[PDB]
Amino acid sequence: HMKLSLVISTSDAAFDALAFKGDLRKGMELAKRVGYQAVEIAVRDPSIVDWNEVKILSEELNLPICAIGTGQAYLADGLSLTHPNDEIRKKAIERVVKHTEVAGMFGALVIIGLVRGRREGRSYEETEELFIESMKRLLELTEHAKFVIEPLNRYETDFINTIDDALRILRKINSNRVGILADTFHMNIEEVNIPESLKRAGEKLYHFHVADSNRWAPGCGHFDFRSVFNTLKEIGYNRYVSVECLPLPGGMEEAAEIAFKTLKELIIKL
């Protein structure tokens, strides 16, 4: 009952509103043509996008938006939920609230990846406490939003690198509106035994990102997707499997097609 989704890259609408709209339309039409059941997007600042135009596009194509990424809020705007400057922490929370407003229009998950920030020379314990405070604030501020924490590899952050790191935090937050997003590219570096890590996540696995070991289309590296999909079946995972990969080999369209074929075969034989 798993469903396949495609992450589509979009230009920043502040830089070029027409480019954003063009990228989005092209990406959603590509997704539908290949066979994906939903798309996933990433936006830096939701306040500059016309979301009713996006919803019309989603309706016309019968293509839901299943998740909204937030990482550029950190990479471009320096906003972090654990920033040592409480003013920036507040601005980060305010930004992510705007992401939840968009997510509510689509029934989408809000991804908490890089926007959580890094240790920045501090103890893990302090960073974790600040993060939990910020997540609790986000939950107090929202009635329906659902969040997923994505463990990322050591080169992207030193805060939450493993599924176990995230499960520990979920137990402290204590809300079913926060779960885990596992990403096979990141797990290939950070997890000891990936099937075991996913069993530990269990019901807390709310979303799934796939890319091969080199972050190319699934099928084009050496990651063992077979064992992963066996485990997803065993834990009863029935939500989205979202392709978040480099446009390789051979560009965005070719990568999306290769990814779909690889994943579809695994799912159907499972």
Ligand SMILES: O=C(CO)[C@@H](O)CO
């Ligand atoms: O995996 C992610 C976002 O899901 C980060 O590495 C940024 O691409």
Ligand SMILES: [Mn+2]
């Ligand atoms: Mn990811």
